[PDB]
Design a protein around this ligand. Sequence first.
Ligand code: SII
Ligand code: SII
Lengths: 368, 368
Amino acid sequence: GSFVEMVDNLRGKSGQGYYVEMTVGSPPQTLNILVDTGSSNFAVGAAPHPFLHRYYQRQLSSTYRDLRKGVYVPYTQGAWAGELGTDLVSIPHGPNVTVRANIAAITESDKFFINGSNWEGILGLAYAEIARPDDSLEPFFDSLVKQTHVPNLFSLQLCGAVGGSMIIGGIDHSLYTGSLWYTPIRREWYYEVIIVRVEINGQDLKMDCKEYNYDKSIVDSGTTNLRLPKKVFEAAVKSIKAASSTEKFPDGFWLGEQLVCWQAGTTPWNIFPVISLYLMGEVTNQSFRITILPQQYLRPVSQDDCYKFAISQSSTGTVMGAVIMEGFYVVFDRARKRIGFAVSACHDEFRTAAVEGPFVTLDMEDCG
Amino acid sequence: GSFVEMVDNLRGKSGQGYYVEMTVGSPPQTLNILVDTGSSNFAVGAAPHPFLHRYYQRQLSSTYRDLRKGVYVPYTQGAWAGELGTDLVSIPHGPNVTVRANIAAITESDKFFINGSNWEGILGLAYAEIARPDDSLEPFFDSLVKQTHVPNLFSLQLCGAVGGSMIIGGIDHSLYTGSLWYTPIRREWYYEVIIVRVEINGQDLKMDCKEYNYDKSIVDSGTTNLRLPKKVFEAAVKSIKAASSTEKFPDGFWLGEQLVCWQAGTTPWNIFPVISLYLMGEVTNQSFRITILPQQYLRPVSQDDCYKFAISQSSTGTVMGAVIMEGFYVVFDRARKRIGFAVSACHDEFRTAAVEGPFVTLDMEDCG
Ligand SMILES: CC(=O)Nc1ccc(CN2CCC3(CC2)C(NC2CCCCC2)=NC(=O)N3c2cccc(F)c2)cc1
Ligand SMILES: CC(=O)Nc1ccc(CN2CCC3(CC2)C(NC2CCCCC2)=NC(=O)N3c2cccc(F)c2)cc1
């Protein structure tokens, strides 16, 4: 139980992201920061905004150093602009260290902050290759490992409906049951992995495995959904529809355009299939599988329980977002270039999320 | 309001001391630490003890370094023994820094820990001259200032009945009203000061001022009482008795051997005198005075309110303990070798604690 003080250091509202407290500058300014394994910049709201309860005040921090360079980070859905600098940073419920880190002070944004989320910045935990303005801006975790003796590893327990744990520098055995199964990090930019097989209720989707990782597959704590490449999305929806045919749903439900609601406590979880993603293992021809329940891929949105189908389509590869992570204790073992999955200590009485192996899967190298 | 996150970072039970959270080692181990300006060792309970809710577990800290030397710290009333080492230390509700500090792991003690106090160690904030085993063991605050940019200053707001604030690296203007008055630190060992005059209800005690500082006068957050040298104690008690003669008290009350209790809300504060200590100022022949109310020097010990007279005798000089500090915001300005007093933002409807000046006092140098 040595990592006990980091347990339950994450909070969130359902579907709006998990955040950790980080303390920046001198004297201390503590903010709520989105934990985001799908980006690589540490950035904080630094000016008033309708959706922010507070923001970073650089003028009040004696240890703040303006890098006198701007930074812009755009996505499909939203973007922010700000000014680069460095400052002292700690994580009060994380490792017992203080580092000098790059920090982007967000002065303007479009569709970035979420009304009511309670977070005021983002902690990009992915690698420098995808940092903005470029890969010379050292990400936070790189600084942490370079400046301290903290082991080059973190792990995430995301508990759905929110709370969870980010263990920095180690693995907490109370956060999981059974064994940890590891898949290689294919390339250090995003947390890129290789999906070798997909099943819906034990039935192989039977697509060429290249399609599952078409253009990449990433593990992303900052994305809510399981996102699938279009061809894979279509086949997966066809199969899920067929397996859940004891009730019919509007087409728009599968497209996230319509919600379905059930009276409190009556959601027929039993009618929906389990989904298995097989991941490349650490030994030649060996794989393992992670299995998710409808409780993960149907996300709650007061007499009625409304759900949105949280599998969606992508044109930029597969994104294993929070719907996948919530079933699991996930280990970002950067030191050994691998990601681990185990059943989370945070299902129903008939079925459980699972991590199972080993399986024999040949030509897995062909899937990338 | 830049020091806001350090406000209210102290807790305590009445008469049992004020403590701050400190986080030691890797992974983090957070303990409650007595804030003690009357000693100079950082030391923590490191083995089970009936009176400890928790203790430091060196074996669980990867960053702990055994100095392989023992340490023993004795007082009149109590003592502890332990092992010297170093480890990473932060103060989660103090400065945003992490330092490597000397830490004594307390393995045995006699009459040191207090049953029910909620603290598990001590933070000796005084100077190296009085560190054990000797002055080569750098105290915590010295390490803090040497390793970081934190200004060489702290201040204490002790709020009586408990809570309070320790502001590290600065002064928080919301914690006091009126002006700060400074007295020199005569010598850097204890926080030694010079008392130049004492009044009971505005009446000069008329003792030679050398007696007030006979052998030293110190400011000590770890001592509950105002402690006075015997000759001064006797004169002060005679005067307080005379000024409070509208009611009579047993002799043992003035000696702390007897308590007196009053039905809730009926304590006749009005019958007891105010006490003024005049302190050497920063300019030639200039002094100022701090004035304390019976609410400070009568300390509460359920239909009745019991009090102990918290002025007591000493054979080792005057000790301005928590009964003095509680009236005031106290600034330990180590950088400018001076201690500041202002009226605390934490009295009755007729009288208030006060810090007043300037007064003309000649030959103050003769008082040491
Ligand atoms: C209002 C709101 O919901 N705020 C929000 C939510 C969440 C987040 C973390 N991330 C940032 C980035 C994110 C996924 C989530 C992305 N991801 C990747 C590109 C490369 C390939 C594989 C996905 N595409 C996007 O359009 N994103 C995106 C999504 C929503 C808003 C946004 F501003 C960007 C930030 C901001
Ligand atoms: C059980 C308990 O009450 N625990 C306690 C209380 C408080 C504390 C902080 N300090 C430590 C030291 C203290 C004053 C308070 C001291 N002070 C000075 C010497 C030099 C000259 C001017 C006073 N004399 C003593 O006998 N002390 C002393 C007092 C009580 C217990 C004890 F173990 C030592 C520690 C431990």
